[PDB]
Amino acid sequence: MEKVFYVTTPIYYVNAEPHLGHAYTTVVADFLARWHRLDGYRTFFLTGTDEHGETVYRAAQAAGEDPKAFVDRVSGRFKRAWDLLGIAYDDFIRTTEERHKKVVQLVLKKVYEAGDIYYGEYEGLYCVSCERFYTEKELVEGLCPIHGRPVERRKEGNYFFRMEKYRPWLQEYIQENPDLIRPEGYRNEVLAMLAEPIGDLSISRPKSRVPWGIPLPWDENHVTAVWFDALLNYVSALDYPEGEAYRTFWPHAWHLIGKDILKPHAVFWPTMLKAAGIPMYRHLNVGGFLLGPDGRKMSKTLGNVVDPFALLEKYGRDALRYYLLREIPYGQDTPVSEEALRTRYEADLADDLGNLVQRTRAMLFRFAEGRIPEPVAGEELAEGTGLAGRLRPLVRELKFHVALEEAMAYVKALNRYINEKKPWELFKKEPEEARAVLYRVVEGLRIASILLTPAMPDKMAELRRALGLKEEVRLEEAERWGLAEPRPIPEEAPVLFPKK
Ligand SMILES: [Zn+2]
């Protein structure tokens, strides 16, 4: 009724091996979802896999497996990847699901009955071996990018969608809705796209050519083009028509994507929505490329590919998540490297945060009978309660890196305070004063740990446990001072961020 958050990631080609790009987009969507859940929002986080098309079908036959059984198996790679990365999604939609088929056909019908679909002839360069058309731009030296052999000009009957009909509306909508396309730079890129005619697009191909997919409701002899099929996942996962999920979350839809698929989301998708009579989404948030160490786009031929699972294996889920969120301004092409993750890990996590927790524990045993002291005013550290309010807008404006920098700045402030006040000296002439300074550091760690939870869920809970603090938290708790209770801390606690 009041606070609702809906975020989606693109559904990935089911047969593609999970890589850094997939990992990044999903981790960002997870941070957003986790953050809004923490801030009291009714949240829905969607992700999934695109499993239709002749390419996957071919792959299945190649492997000598039934197509459905094939996608059931390979989709597991993404599910395992998300499990490994600690992604807490609410739903994992697969385009083979029955509910997806029903929504796609129901939407196709509306658009059909609305007069935006006609039968025409598709002509162009064709590779009979790939059984698909190719634009000169797709050919590699005028040859099939797959078979590396010449292509021929063929014709094929296809049903088409009158997308151009909606260009005028779309151009005006984007012009009137300045914040629709998030990172500013991409809005201009899309406005440039909408400048020229966008024409009509093929929305189907004969089942004889593409046998894997959703049939058109008015012609079971044709299969819905994968582009159209995949995009509707955003509403089919909400059971669009009658689903209460659709009524609840669609009005707050936030789509996260890599710039690679900007056109389909900023141009195709909006016209489909308008044609079907579905409200526009609230925001399209465009991410940039994660470049290799050398600053160039990642590619095997360049040998600058960075494996996210190798990094996760070596440094751990939390270290990787924190690094991707802190080091990369969302939307800005940025180089990534193990060395950068390592430095970030050792500096920010092992030193700044981890060691502070460890020496706080030590000092609590030395000057506080191994427990949290009685609460006292925060004084110079009370400002920590203002961080949540400062970070909210940052997070919502996709400035995750700035949000994390400010949270860590407070952590550095806590370190600075101890070395400044020196409770080990105050204890000499006045222990009570030493216990007051200690309480302030513990309460500060509590607040900071809350703000960082969406980035490092497991490790922040472990930090909380290490200080005997309430483990499950709410962002609102980070806005009040004196909540840490004077209870005993665990006799022993493992090193929060161990050396790697
Ligand atoms: Zn080919």
From Swiss-Prot:
Top-level taxon of the source organism: Bacteria
Listed binding positions for Zn(2+) are C127, C130, C144, H147
Q: Describe the reaction catalysed, as an equation.
A: tRNA(Met) + L-methionine + ATP = L-methionyl-tRNA(Met) + AMP + diphosphate
Q: List all disulphide bridges recorded for this chain.
A: none
> Which N-terminal stretch is annotated as signal sequence?
none
Positions with a binding annotation for ATP? K300
Which segment of this protein is annotated as the motif 'KMSKS' region? 297-301
Q: Cofactor(s) for this protein?
A: Zn(2+)
Q: How is the cofactor bound?
A: Binds 1 zinc ion per subunit.
A molecular function GO annotation? tRNA binding
Coordinates of motif 'HIGH' region in the sequence? 12-22
What is known about its subunit structure? Homodimer.
Family of this protein:
Belongs to the class-I aminoacyl-tRNA synthetase family. MetG type 2A subfamily.
Protein's name according to its UniProt entry: Methionine--tRNA ligase
- Span covered, complete protein: 1 to 500 of 618
